[PDB]
Design a protein around this ligand. Sequence first.
Ligand code: NA
Ligand code: NA
Ligand code: NA
Ligand code: NA
Lengths: 292, 292, 292, 292
Amino acid sequence: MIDFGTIATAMVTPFDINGNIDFAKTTKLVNYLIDNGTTAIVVGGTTGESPTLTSEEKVALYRHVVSVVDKRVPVIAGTGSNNTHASIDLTKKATEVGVDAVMLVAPYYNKPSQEGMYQHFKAIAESTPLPVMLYNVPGRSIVQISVDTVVRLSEIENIVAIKDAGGDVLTMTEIIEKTADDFAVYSGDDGLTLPAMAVGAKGIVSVASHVIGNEMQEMIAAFQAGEFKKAQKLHQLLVRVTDSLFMAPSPTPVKTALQMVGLDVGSVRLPLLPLTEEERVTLQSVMQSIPR
Amino acid sequence: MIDFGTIATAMVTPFDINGNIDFAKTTKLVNYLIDNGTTAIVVGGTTGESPTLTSEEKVALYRHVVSVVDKRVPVIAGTGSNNTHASIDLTKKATEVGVDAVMLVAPYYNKPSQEGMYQHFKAIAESTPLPVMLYNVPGRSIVQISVDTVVRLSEIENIVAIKDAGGDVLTMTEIIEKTADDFAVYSGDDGLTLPAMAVGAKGIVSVASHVIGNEMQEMIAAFQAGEFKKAQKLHQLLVRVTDSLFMAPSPTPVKTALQMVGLDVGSVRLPLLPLTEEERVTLQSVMQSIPR
Amino acid sequence: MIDFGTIATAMVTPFDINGNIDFAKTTKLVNYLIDNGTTAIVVGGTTGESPTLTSEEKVALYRHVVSVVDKRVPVIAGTGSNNTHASIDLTKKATEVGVDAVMLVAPYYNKPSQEGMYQHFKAIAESTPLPVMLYNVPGRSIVQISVDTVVRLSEIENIVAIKDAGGDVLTMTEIIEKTADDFAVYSGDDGLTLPAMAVGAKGIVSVASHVIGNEMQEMIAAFQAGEFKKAQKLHQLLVRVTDSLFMAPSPTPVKTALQMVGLDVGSVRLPLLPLTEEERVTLQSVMQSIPR
Amino acid sequence: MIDFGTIATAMVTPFDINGNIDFAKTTKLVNYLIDNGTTAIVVGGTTGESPTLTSEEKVALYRHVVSVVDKRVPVIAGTGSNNTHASIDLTKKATEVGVDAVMLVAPYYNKPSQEGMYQHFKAIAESTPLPVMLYNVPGRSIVQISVDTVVRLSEIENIVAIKDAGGDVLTMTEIIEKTADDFAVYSGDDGLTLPAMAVGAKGIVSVASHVIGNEMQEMIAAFQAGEFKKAQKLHQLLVRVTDSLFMAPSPTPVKTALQMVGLDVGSVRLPLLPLTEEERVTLQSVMQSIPR
Ligand code: NA
Ligand code: NA
Ligand code: NA
Ligand code: NA
């Protein structure tokens, strides 16, 4: 059974001055994340700006990350969209370039039923030997993958995990209870890392780990040890930092926070925009508040 | 400038048994629409399953419809997605196959800010000489194009209309008030046609016009002639039929309805699914209730 | 069948400098309403601060408004609360002081089921021979009285109307269709007056009629005569004025607006507060924008 | 500093066959709760059907529970309503019958602003020497007590705690952090007990402790010890039992569940209704699945 560990990081896609994928900065960010508590890398997720990458950018980004990671941590490619056939296609291409797993988002915009989503995820899972991580995100796709739906899908052999960004640790709980023990439930919301884990989540698919990966690993280890007060103080920092990373449409704030800590990964592609001066000042304060 | 009339139809995209575009059936549907109360055709919109069409299928569909329509009513291509650069490229290709305008949805899934959407729509609008219709649809894209953003964009000369599927005639009211008279505000919810026109909407971008376009046309004319009891009875029919067309994810029910009235336009692409038998029966009862 | 006409006003309750009911200002306000387009007066509704009136004060206010009105318009007492047996006692007491109807709100806070509300409204309506108006207001009670529950209740002989503050003219449409012709449907949202009447609503239970009741009447008459452009201009005034009356918890803004136009009805009881200076300045500007 | 312990229970109010307060059953319920993990009793809260009790009934219920409890655990009287003046009055009466604290709900139905709530809670807190627990319940009152409002109120000497039934452990986190260490933050949702305590909540104000208080106590002792396997297992039980308790308007399900475990506390007052035979069967099956 593939193990993504306790912190999968949904990596940003570094862009150069022309907005193209900056491959050399990508290498640098990949090694930095692996050195700072990242235990698996989700490439070309929401946070990697999957909406504005082309299919061929995605494939090349996947290829390059696989090569740089060199099997040090699992590489999960965000291949699902709201088009089942295009999702199968991009999943085949990801597999061909050696990724370890695919992450498949709930179809956004076209609002499929539970049965539609069942068939969509079933057909994408069936097209690859790779492990599949479902990605529940009603705050962007509107629909939710219902508990019953996730459970039906978990019975498929290569559907092994869910990244639940639904904000609800009680639906998480119910998924944990109703699926086999080898079905890994991850939080998809940084601030819920600690409470999700309290109820049995395996960990977090993270954005905040770009800047506080080590603190998050410390938090998690403290909690598992029963060191509640130490875990709570770090949870407080996690929640505060997470809030500042979503003051504006993600991933611009985290791309900006990274620039502020010495790791320039470029800007973002339209329709996302650079932070304003005032947004930047607000963010820099929060960044400057992190214990060094 | 351009006049879309009172009923723009968001045409379905007819598919054959294998999901391929059925261009001969598209011909029959276009002519059917134009002779049943449609005054402008929106090709490749949400209802046309734009999410599951490739960019190449979109242009081919735009070209076919332009050619069949033969200038009898305006052809509006659904070229916008949540990717600004891609939207520019598709918009250019639609302009070169001779569409009369483009429609641009609020970017879904990536949750841009008001300023981000301002820049997205301006960039697309400045890439074409064609008239542009904005498409506000928070029930699919989550974000709303705020009134102030709409008004800002309406000051751009080739941004000429909005399809407001926000379900709120008070925001449509405020848009009407705050924009110049040459900016046309359309309802994007069939059931709200009558109350939207009551507050000064130009008309409806319709789904139900695929099966009750003539009743809709009579409704609008009754209203405008001060025949309120007649307008109200047609409105009740319009509301009832629209409800039944949204009992499963659109446009499966309208494609099924079309088949029930002799115009078989095939089925839908994953992640959408055909109606179940139980669903088919409930829909057939509603169709049989339409006064013939 | 009792008739409330086109504009029932949810009258504010004038308070003196100590927060007590001001009987002289109540008289003055009633006479003012009747001369300024109000066809029926809802006394002790939400806008009358029913939550902070004692039971004895409500009945005293009913009694006073009845004597002042002297059968010139129907008097509807807001007797319903979230406690069915208290609502029965208060309804009987209102019946004894000679009101013409009672209005019964969907129970707030305790979240009853559809069947609980059915029984709640049934038992109160049986406690009196007077006409009963239901009041649907999900943005205060959370629950909504479903269409089917409204229909079931409309078959009760003395349940004759509904004030529908659900903000949705399509559910109003559906209530209109499914209930008998002698069941009157009112918008409970001023800005929706015109679009609700477009779909067959009887009129508005209004707040804005305290300051623009004459314009409201002209709008309704313009509309009914098919003078659409005139209706629309006044509709725009209605919406703009209504919005300013809801920028702070109601009814403080409408009480302040009344003071501004020379009819001082005092302030509000805790937990409501007077407008801040900045709020006042902003409301004063909208009030100065009403054409005189 | 008053200490409500980890499980405050919002006690149901036992009624006799006539709907009147059953004082003998209240005694039995109180002694049962105290012997089954309850560390503080909230009397006449939501679950105690505060909306259907008269002011006289509440005071008699408060006085009786005070006598029975006999200082064994703190007695918290649910004296706040949406009327500040009435709340001051009832708070004074509860203080006189010897309760240890009062719980003040966010005003429902009238939708006060943050400053309005601030003045409301401040004026009630000033009127009593007793400790005050705030109660945030936006799922019943619609408005939320903002984090900044709670922080301001926590600075008042006798405002010492909040029952946060907001469903969001991230706002709880922020309240914990921004308030002093002697301000206790309780969850008001049973299913969130563990995740809320993981982030720093002192405990739960519970409904399910009526029928699984011993299991919740065990779950909490396991969690505080750091035995997450036993805690997660009792957490699953708690989530499932809680869900079965809110399948119809509360407290009818927990009153029925009580009867099922042999402590009949009668039925509920309109607008609430007994469970159907069907609901009773479904509930009974969940009650049967609790390891005995
Ligand atoms: Na499991
Ligand atoms: Na305009
Ligand atoms: Na009717
Ligand atoms: Na604190």
